[PDB]
Amino acid sequence: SGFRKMAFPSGKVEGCMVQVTCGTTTLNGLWLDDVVYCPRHVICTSEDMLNPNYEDLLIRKSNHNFLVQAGNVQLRVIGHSMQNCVLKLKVDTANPKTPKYKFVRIQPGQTFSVLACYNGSPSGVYQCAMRPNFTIKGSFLNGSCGSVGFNIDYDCVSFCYMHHMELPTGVHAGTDLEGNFYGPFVDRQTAQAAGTDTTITVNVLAWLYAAVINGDRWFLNRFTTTLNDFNLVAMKYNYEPLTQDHVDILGPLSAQTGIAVLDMCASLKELLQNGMNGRTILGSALLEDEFTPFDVVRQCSGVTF
Amino acid sequence: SGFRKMAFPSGKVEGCMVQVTCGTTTLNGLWLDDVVYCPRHVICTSEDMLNPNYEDLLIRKSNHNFLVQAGNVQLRVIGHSMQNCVLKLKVDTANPKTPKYKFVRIQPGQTFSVLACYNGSPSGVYQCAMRPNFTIKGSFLNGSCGSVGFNIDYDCVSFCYMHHMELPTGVHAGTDLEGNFYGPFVDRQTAQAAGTDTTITVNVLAWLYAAVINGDRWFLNRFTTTLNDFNLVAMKYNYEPLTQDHVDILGPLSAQTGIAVLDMCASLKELLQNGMNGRTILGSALLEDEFTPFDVVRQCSGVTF
Ligand SMILES: O=C(Cc1cccc(F)c1)Nc1cncc2ccccc12
Ligand SMILES: O=C(Cc1cccc(F)c1)Nc1cncc2ccccc12
Ligand SMILES: [Cl-]
Asked: Which catalytic residues are annotated (chains A, B)?
């Protein structure tokens, strides 16, 4: 019993964090095998940030301009290349702590653990979701660039995010580990704003099923809804549209609790209309949207209470 | 920017988790140096749990009755002893991954990271607080016994909790690493209940300072209060008393934000009497009490380990 915002154990990622310095700029790098991955903006000055020509800034650098520190050991850079917005520094030592890993690009609504780092040293671990507007509501200070987001299903680390920047609203933008940004963002100091964010509907439904599994049913009602009527109501509360894919994905949770997906949608519609009336659901007075259907099945018991 | 419920990096603890099996019961153990620590109820059958005589159950066991598995390696138990509610299994191999550590007993209100484990394998990490009623609102399923709670101070892991049981309300009870329970609990299958809980006042104040640091100031007001008038109001809402020690500990946050502790107390008093009026603070419609003043400073400064 209980339901917490739970991150993956960070040990496998901690053994990959290094410090990358280029001139006066220091940030984090991810050392996997003989390659250190980091944001390409480590080569920029604050001036270079408005309209940086990364190809031009990079061609002026040699391997010895990049200082890589793994604990108290200086790694030797023997090559460098840019792939999209990530800089790949080839080093002369393979990381002996390299876990089984993959690079995965995630979709909005997906969750992941973030290991926040400063100077190549891990500071904390927290759970995030990729918002529908492609930002993440992280907790990052200056020096956190290069910190990564990941999932660890089995003993394989799936790296899905590398931190690059903080937008003016305090939310964060970054790339996958191939250097492709999530969203329309650029690694430039030019005016950029996060689009209007919406609630991850499929995740709220998953979390309502987590509440039913843990013993709570106060929010259920005798009604059902069509998928289209649900979406018409949901969009008025800035909720993402629920697709047939989402309905299918919620199948297992629906079968375990005995509550049809469209019946849970009816409960959600009523919660949006009424609020909670002084009640909580899994210790929360707001509808939680940073647990996916997969997270709920992983955390909750296979036996409903 | 941003403020998340953040756990310590769990890597140093992950390298200590082992599986302990005694008969049909499998749970988790903490392997530090040549000793594996685990709940003493691992030696009990379901019938024994009704009224156990642990000295009598233990004297019937030999070293070879305890199977300890560290990854895919079977450790050989060369001795066994009980200290309060923890069983200490002496093994022939010192854990090469033993970090710098201490066993510390925490006070209610103090926070710690929990590395939830099943079959000696870490599954997730989350942050929680020792409630004033000595329970923890964890997320634990069957097989999670022996999972530990910890903090990190510099490079030293301070182990403060070992999981033993779940109470009927879904909340959790355990011991320090010396086997002393937090709370008036016993490791026996008998009628036990969590007492009425209260809110950790100093922690709510710390979280209000975190909100102010993060640009959420709508709740600030021109008013101040005396410590005694605040405590009279706080007692009415099932909030823990605020002591002069709590006022002192929040001093740095009072100085950084310019809001005196008693000035923040008058904001809290107004929130208790009037609610949030449809507003949120750091994305929450409830007053959060699982961040200590130290947690707020650490996260709002980027301390690494
Ligand atoms: O945003 C940047 C640098 C930057 C600027 C423009 C484009 C970039 F790609 C990168 N750094 C930070 C990242 N995360 C959190 C921060 C918090 C405070 C101050 C800086 C923070
Ligand atoms: O509570 C116990 C066993 C127990 C029983 C009586 C006294 C004890 F000291 C220990 N184990 C569990 C721990 N956490 C979560 C659980 C969830 C479901 C089922 C068991 C769970
Ligand atoms: Cl995805």
From this structure: 41, 145
Terminal alpha carbon distance of chain B: 20
Ligand 1 pocket residues where CB is under 6 Å: A 41, 49, 140-142, 144-145, 164-166, 187-189; B 1
User: How far is it, in rounded angstroms, from Cα A33 to Cα A99?
Assistant: 9
Chain B residue closest in CA terms to A12: B11
d(CA B44, CA B24): 9
| Beta carbons of B214 and B253 less than 8 angstroms apart | no
Tell me the angle at which helices B227-236 and B261-274 cross, rounded to the nearest 10 degrees: 30
Nearest CA in chain A to B9: A124
**Residues in a beta bridge with B19:** B28, B69
CATH T-level topology, domain A1-14+100-197: Thrombin, subunit H (2.40.10)
How far is it, in rounded angstroms, from Cα B241 to Cα B231?
6
Interface touch B125/A166, C-beta < 8 Å: no
- Residue B296, Cβ density class (10 Å: 0-12 exposed, 13-18 middle, ≥19 buried): buried
Is the C-beta atom of B51 inside 6 A of ligand 2? no
C-alpha pair distances (Å), B44 with each of A105, B23, B86: 47, 9, 13
Atom of ligand 1 nearest to the CA of A166: 1
- DSSP H or E stretch at residue B208: helix B201-213
Ligand 1 mean position to A187 CA, how many Å? 9
Alpha carbons A293 and A251: distance in angstroms, whole number = 10
As given in the structure block, the two tokens for residue B185 are 């609990």
Q: How far apart are CA A291 and CA A303, in angstroms?
A: 19
For the residues of B99-164, what is the DSSP string, one character each? -EEEE-PPPTT-EEEEEEEETTEEEEEEEEE--TTS-B-----TT-TT-EEEEEETTEEEEEEEEE
| Sign of the torsion formed by the C-alpha atoms of B234, B201, A8 and A112 | positive
Residue type, B89: L
Distance CA A76, CA A71 (A): 14
* Torsion region of B176: left, alpha or beta (phi above 0 gives left; psi -120 to 50 gives alpha): beta
Q: Where are the CATH 1.10.1840.10 domain residues in chain A?
A: 198-301
For chain A, where do the domains classified as CATH 2.40.10.10 start and end? 1-14+100-197, 15-99
Contact A116 B166 (CB under 8 A): no
Minimal CA–CA distance to B283: which of A138, A140, A110, A270?
A: A138
CATH number of B198-301: 1.10.1840.10
CA dihedral B185, B187, B191, B195 (to 10 degrees): 20
